[PDB]
């Protein structure tokens, strides 16, 4: 009787019913956005002519004078705006171009100005400016992950801080493990990870508030955020002239610090003629430590907490802490500070509140209530709100710099804790930073530490773009998941701790920490993963032996690590497969790669013979290597002939890691590796990248709509891991028609990756354009979070074997793949104790060694070995190939 | 170098160094509020002589003329307003009072013009009018709880929809469990139970937005909540001249409808000359199936839904739902509609909006951007947002009536269910409310089932606020609990399901139920929580579709004798007695109704049982903290090692820790089921437990009886032998220089209430209680104790570590009121009654508008416990708090129901002269009046004529009568 319409139809789109019925009429161009003008879908309100996709009807109906323009036409009759000359016309389905009314055309103007750069743009250096005024593609598109640096101090791994700050400052702030400097918010939508209040501020002028950090008013002119390597800067300029600089970066350790410190230092220069009398009210909440008892027990959440006031010397007040009555919960203690600079003259906040209630009254937290005039009380209990208050004056020209230090201590670091050792320790703090000076030192030495830890790998080629792409926005994120694996980011923001697999991090990020001589923090996290096998840990070890796969990944960091610095003074993978061939090319590797450690140091040499010959003989299913292979009653899974497909057009369940395993391992021979080519050429191919797997109804021995995630998504972790096969056999094999084929979808895929490539059409493929996330939606092409991402990892692996490194007994194994359209290729390379600068020239079209004819000049010598030896000398050398 | 100043640590308040500063210079009245200037908390600003405490400074720097009139004297120096006249002025610590500007004497005057109803008031039917403006007590103080009605329906206790509701209208709604048909909120504050937008809408007059249901602005001039039995009404009126109305209530459950729907009435009036063109916003958060990744992994439940839409016959939209793709999120289907009625014409909305960011865009909630205009998108992703959009005129005078359904069917009620079962269900509904008037029929068809339901028993005493708090909205809470036990109310969030000592809540509404002719109902829950006792005699400790941990807690158990025993009683229907009910052990198997009683006597008494005859403790009893034992068998872990030991009857081989607060429990489950026993024709099982009990109690009396006060634990584990017991003189087990021993109010109580203790006991008792136990706000739960190595969670005053647990101390109340009755020694009884009245008066909602600011709670609604350093009810709203104080105000008035039918023995207060209230039975009606000189006074001690219907019975016993005609009980004490 009733009927019902979900999201996903067979129905057609507004921009479809725009071109139904004034395709002919009018000109659309290339994109137009459009919109439904009733339930019913029957009429659609739009505008023709956009220079990309954009959600620009949206944008529009913000404006009032626009919304009530078109109640004159819909929602009875269709209607279309179009940009004739300068002057815009609205188009009735009736014929008549009518000329709209002076105002609408004064909106539809300034509407459609700058569409091309509503998602914001990259600077030369890979940070991307962003206005807060426009619509995000997605929740993690205008999103930055900073992290503090606890090299050469105790445990780096678990007690290295980590925050996440979206455009307007947004978010929260850990310290070791899932211990919360700033509360984390649990709610429905992905846009909100932190409490609201956390880090923004308001500014009062004789009463009113002029200002809020959250808010973009008719006050604000201009409003734009800078993210980069580790910091994030936010400007604002109002029209009563005052130029608003939010800077928020983590404080790197020093010697008697707290565990976790975050600085956010707040400049106001008074642009006008006149001097102001302004004050501040910095805001934030503090994160619990009873996390689970937010869901379980609230009450008990607040109950066993008070605020606390803290004071230096002097008798004066600096800030707020929270103070626990639970042992449990006093083992960290977290603070806020606050010093207001005027020149000369270092001052605290003269006032403050911690009750929510009390701060916000009648009003909201945009527009409290008690905002200028704070009631000085502490609470007796949670939540650990608090507001920070200070006044101070700014003559014409000069500046106010405000800094905050928002934090804590920890019984981790310090035997014997109390909240006496916070207090020794924040102390340390604000002396460290009592000139102003000292907070834009620490800024560049954070900027210094990040430019010199990417020198491992520079690529010099022309696309800027690319370059800081790769040299700072990959490498950092690549640093970024060594430490926090899979654990905090946007959304991802639940109990997961350290996995025994996000050891994969290490793969990449080795190289770039053993070339700023910590190679001994190398060491020291392969032991904290060799401990555990485990499949989880941070302190402790959790879900012990529940994963097949974890145990055999250690190999493979032993393995690169020994290989590349000659160091022998040291000694399943689908989380939705419940029903392992994978693992057969996992010990294979593993077997294979301890043979190469020994040497170096026949028992493994004979074994890994017998360890192949079982895997091709019986794991060979005629079309491609299987998955899971059933003798438990039903064959096997994943070939032809396993009999488990949910498609009539399809033969079996292919799974894109069984490919590409076979190839990493050496085990698939060169006639296997082309029959599996043209397998996953038919069905895990898609427009948007090789999908994980082909459908199956696994029923007969899901959670997600086809598209997300497991249900046939292209997962990016698992398609750059077949990258990193195809490159490997594009490499080796004998026929140069099937290495340039490996090669093409290789770049293919690489080029659905690349983070810079998002802001190309941003609307469609959001993602984000600094950092890789999870996966692409087949339906749609959408980058997906998390943000946290084996993609990184392994993309960074990949573009390097693309570019031709790969580490030997011997040395480097030079052979670079290059794209068919690329006739150059430059990049500088470290190496422990000496350098490399590496030149490729080749004639357009696919070249590679094992077919092309080339010269290869090391140092002018002219080497046909293909191996580079790793010099000691300490001195840059040139390396040359010229493909004929 | 650097100090911490806590919030307890902090030495002087600023009331204090107000009085300090200007205590002998003003006059300051009995009240007075003040803030600290500066954060070195030096000096103070404040306001004299206030009707009762109050935030009066908090409110007063909300204006901002008073803000900048105090910029000229503080921080420097302290200050205080006075009001000499009808002019202010501000008083300097240096001599002066100066006469304030009129602009802040307007304001001055304007905000203390009445601190004394601030917090709202009572009307004469007990309901709390709000004003939306003013600060709240707390965070339950604003809250009422609307329930559904499930009663001849299918699992009534399982399915019946909950939801609550604040003064503007925020919160969450639930079906089954803990289904959520709107947004629950988990964060950081108590205040936030909701999604915000849930139940919440905007108002839009030619392009511009005029209203929003959670902002009071400039435009609103009055604007007031009134919360009442089981719905609120939130009224508006704005400057432009509309009248908005907006009436919550849930739909009590009709043949073909869908198990959950909640139902809110928006009328708005045109008061103006002119018409108006406007249109309203709807807006609302669907919960989310995936409840447990909200935390895990917000992703997932973002990407495992998507919005539909919904369309009738004639292709009209007429609301949204959200679709599941796992089939285990595919058993609840959800919806919300809106039916616009204008006079004759009824319509549908003609928008819609499902992303939260699309409807909010550049501006905020309150003003969202893209508000006016909705774009009709259906999201590919949850969350699960909607905004439903309607345009309407309203001619001057004529009044718009606004009808939404928020609600979800569910496979819970519906055999092979789909989406399509919800879509017949939902179209019934609407057909059902097609007409106008419908919706004002089913409100006060809601409205007289509770009027009628609370008929039961009615007070008419002089202070209306009493009869109405008892009549109407006590009886209420005890109802709610009845079917939500502890798992839903304003904080009460998280899973919690039913729980098995949560029984207690039917020992009050039992008489209730069975009087509106739902005794079916009563012996319906019986037999549910009776399922859950095993062959052997323990149990189940908590369920909710299916029953969990069995004798893990070692009460459970023992509390459903109780409820048998006070059914039986008052119907004499032993016919339940022989009845055939599924246990929890095995099989499909039944046992007699006669059997699962005598199981779980003979297990309390026979088996599982220590050195000195009592029960056993196992893990835990009633008190949630108070983890002792070290390796605690399960119940089908001694029902394998009872077995064990053989290789009925005989006791199970341990030396564990023995609950005497148990020992009182199984002493009068034995006692109980003797008295059923003998109504039961059967002088054999009489004879078998006649005897019991006088080998149960003598087991106690001797062991238990520590000296000075009945032991808690008895510790019989400890070779060596140090530790003999807890909970008297000599235990060594205190946290108290001054105190020797810890002393449980629960030791106490059940004493008395299993009529275990003597009067020599209950007087030496009741000395030890007045000394320690005994404080300003109430009996408290404990006495300070290191049990030690698990260390306190709670400051001192909060929840365990020394807090007023009002139902723990209403148990205390029922054993004081009991002895007050029997005992011998007159002087003794006064005294008892003194304690029981005084303990009352801090429970009963209605006296927390009397200093709410300081008392906080809930005008309406009992809550959990009084913090013994402020004098604050804390909550949460859904406690056993209630149930007992129900129980123990009718056994003051004097019923108490036995064999031969009520035993009239009635305790009033000292300063009563009057006692007058109806009271109703299955086949009759009762009408009590008492009349007796100030002073203390009963029947045990004074001199006394008792009435029936004319003729003077001296026999203090009254037959339960079935001749249909309400009889006259008069008592005069001389
Ligand atoms: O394997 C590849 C890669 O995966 C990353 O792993 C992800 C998976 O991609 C993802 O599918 C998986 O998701 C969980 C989800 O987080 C849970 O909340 C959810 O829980 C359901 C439960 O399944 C139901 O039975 C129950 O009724 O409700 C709950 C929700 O309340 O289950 C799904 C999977 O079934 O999450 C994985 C991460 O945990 C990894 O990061 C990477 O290491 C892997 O290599
Ligand atoms: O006994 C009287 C009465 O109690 C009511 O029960 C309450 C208790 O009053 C209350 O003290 C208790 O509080 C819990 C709290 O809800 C839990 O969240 C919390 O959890 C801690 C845990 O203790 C730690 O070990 C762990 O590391 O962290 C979590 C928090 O993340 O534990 C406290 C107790 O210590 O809650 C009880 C409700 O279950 C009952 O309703 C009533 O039946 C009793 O008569």
């Known amino acids: 009787m009733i009927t019902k319409v979900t999201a996903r139809n067979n129905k057609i789109t507004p921009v479809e019913l725009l071109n139904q019925k004034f395709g002919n009429k009018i000109?659309?161009?290339?994109?137009?956005?459009?919109?439904?003008?009733?339930?019913?879908?029957?009429?659609?309100?739009?505008?023709?002519?956009?220079?990309?996709?954009?959600?620009?009807?949206?944008?529009?109906?913000?404006?009032?004078?626009?919304?009530?323009?078109?109640?004159?036409?819909?929602?009875?009759?269709?209607?279309?705006?179009?940009?004739?000359?300068?002057?815009?016309?609205?188009?009735?389905?009736?014929?008549?171009?009518?000329?709209?009314?002076?105002?609408?055309?004064?909106?539809?103007?300034?509407?459609?100005?700058?569409?091309?750069?509503?998602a914001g743009y990259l600077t030369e250096d890979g940070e991307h400016v962003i206005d807060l005024l426009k619509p995000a593609p997605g929740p993690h598109f205008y999103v930055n992950l900073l992290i503090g640096n606890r090299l050469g101090f105790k445990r780096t791994l678990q007690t290295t801080p980590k925050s996440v700050v979206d455009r307007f400052g947004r978010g929260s702030f850990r310290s070791?493990?899932?211990?919360?400097?700033?509360?984390?918010?649990?709610?429905?939508?992905?846009?909100?990870?932190?409490?609201?209040?956390?880090?923004?501020?308001?500014?009062?002028?004789?009463?009113?508030?002029?200002?809020?950090?959250?808010?973009?008013?008719?006050?604000?002119?201009?409003?734009?955020c800078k993210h980069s390597c580790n910091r994030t800067v936010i400007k604002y300029k109002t029209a009563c002239n005052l130029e608003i600089t939010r800077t928020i970066f983590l404080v790197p350790h020093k010697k008697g610090f707290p565990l976790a410190t975050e600085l956010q230092r707040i400049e106001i220069k008074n642009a006008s003629d006149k001097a102001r009398n302004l004050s501040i009210t910095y805001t934030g909440m503090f994160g619990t430590g009873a996390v689970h008892a937010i869901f379980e027990d609230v009450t008990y959440t607040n109950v066993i907490m008070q605020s606390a006031a803290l004071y230096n010397d002097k008798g004066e007040f600096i800030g707020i802490t929270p103070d626990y009555y639970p042992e449990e919960f006093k083992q960290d203690t977290?603070?806020?500070?606050?010093?207001?600079?005027?020149?000369?003259?270092?001052?605290?906040?003269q006032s403050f509140c911690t009750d929510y209630n009390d701060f916000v009254g009648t009003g909201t937290l945009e527009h409290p209530a008690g905002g200028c005039n704070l009631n000085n009380k502490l609470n007796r209990k949670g939540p650990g709100f608090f507001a920070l208050g200070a006044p101070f004056t700014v003559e014409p020209g000069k500046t106010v710099i405000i800094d905050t230090f928002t934090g804590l201590s920890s019984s981790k670091d310090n035997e014997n804790y109390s909240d006496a050792v916070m207090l020794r320790e924040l102390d340390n703090l604000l002396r460290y930073f009592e000139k102003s000076e000292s907070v834009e030192e620490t800024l560049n030495e954070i900027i210094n530490f990040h430019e010199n830890y990417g020198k491992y790998f520079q690529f010099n080629t022309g696309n800027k773009l690319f370059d800081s792409g790769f040299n700072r926005n990959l490498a950092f994120q690549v640093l970024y998941q060594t430490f926090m694996s899979?654990?905090?980011?946007?959304?991802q923001k639940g109990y997961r701790e350290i996995?025994?697999?996000?050891?994969?991090?290490?793969?990449?990020?080795?190289?770039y920490f053993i070339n700023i001589g910590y190679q001994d923090f190398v060491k020291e996290l392969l032991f904290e993963w060799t401990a555990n096998a485990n499949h989880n840990f941070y302190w402790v070890g959790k879900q012990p032996g529940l994963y097949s796969d974890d145990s055999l990944w250690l190999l493979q960091a032993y393995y690169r690590y020994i290989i590349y610095t000659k160091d022998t003074s040291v000694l399943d993978w689908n989380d939705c497969l419940?029903?392992?061939?994978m693992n057969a090319f996992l010990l294979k590797l593993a077997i294979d790669h301890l043979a190469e450690i020994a040497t170096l140091d026949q028992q493994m040499s004979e074994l890994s013979k017998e360890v192949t010959d079982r895997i091709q003989k019986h794991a060979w299913k005629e079309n491609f290597f299987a998955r899971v292979l059933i003798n438990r009653y039903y064959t096997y899974l994943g070939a032809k002939g396993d009999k488990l497909s949910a498609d009539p057009n399809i033969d079996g369940v292919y799974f894109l890691n069984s490919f590409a395993w076979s190839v990493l391992s050496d085990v698939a021979t060169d006639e296997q590796i082309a029959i599996?080519?043209?397998?996953?050429?038919?069905?895990?191919?898609?427009?948007?990248?090789?999908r994980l797997v082909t459908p199956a109804d696994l029923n007969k021995i899901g959670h997600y709509f086809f598209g997300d995630r497991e249900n046939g998504a292209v997962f990016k972790h698992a398609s750059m891991m077949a990258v990193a096969a195809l490159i490997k056999a594009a490499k080796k094999v004998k026929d140069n028609e099937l290495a340039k084929e490996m090669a093409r979808i290789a770049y293919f895929m690489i080029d659905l990756v690349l983070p810079?490539?998002?802001?190309?059409?941003?609307?469609?493929?959001?993602?984000?354009?600094?950092?890789?996330?999870?996966?692409?939606?087949?339906?749609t092409g959408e980058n997906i979070g998390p943000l946290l991402s084996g993609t990184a990892t392994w993309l960074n692996l990949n573009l390097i074997s693309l570019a031709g490194i790969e580490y030997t007994r011997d040395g480097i194994s030079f052979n670079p793949i290059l794209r068919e359209e690329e006739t150059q290729l430059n990049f500088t390379l470290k190496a422990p104790k000496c350098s490399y600068k590496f030149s490729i020239t080749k004639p357009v079209g696919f070249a590679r060694m094992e077919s092309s004819e080339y010269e290869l000049f090391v140092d002018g010598q002219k080497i046909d070995n293909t191996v580079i030896p790793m010099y000691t000398d300490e001195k840059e050398h040139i390396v040359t190939l010229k493909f004929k």
Not at 340 to 346: L, Y
Not at 499 to 511: T, V
Not at 761 to 777: E, H, K, L
């Open 499 to 511: 996995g025994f697999r996000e050891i994969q991090d290490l793969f990449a990020s080795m190289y």
């Open 334 to 349: 977290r603070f806020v500070t606050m010093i207001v600079r005027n020149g000369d003259e270092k001052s605290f906040p």
């Open 578 to 581: 419940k029903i392992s061939v």
């Open 756 to 779: 810079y490539k998002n802001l190309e059409n941003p609307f469609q493929v959001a993602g984000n354009p600094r950092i890789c996330t999870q996966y692409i939606n087949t339906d």
């Open 486 to 491: 899979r654990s905090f980011g946007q959304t």
């Open 27 to 118: 000109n659309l161009g290339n994109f137009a956005d459009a919109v439904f003008t009733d339930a019913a879908f029957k009429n659609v309100a739009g505008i023709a002519n956009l220079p990309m996709k954009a959600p620009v009807m949206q944008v529009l109906m913000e404006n009032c004078i626009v919304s009530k323009y078109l109640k004159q036409f819909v929602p009875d009759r269709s209607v279309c705006f179009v940009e004739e000359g300068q002057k815009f016309y609205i188009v009735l389905e009736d014929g008549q171009k009518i000329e709209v009314p002076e105002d609408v055309n004064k909106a539809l103007k300034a509407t459609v100005s700058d569409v091309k750069h509503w």
């Open 676 to 690: 599996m080519v043209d397998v996953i050429k038919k069905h895990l191919l898609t427009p948007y990248g090789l």
């Open 176 to 224: 070791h493990a899932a211990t919360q400097v700033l509360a984390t918010r649990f709610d429905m939508r992905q846009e909100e990870n932190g409490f609201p209040a956390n880090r923004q501020f308001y500014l009062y002028e004789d009463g009113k508030q002029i200002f809020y950090s959250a808010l973009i008013d008719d006050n604000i002119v201009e409003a734009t």
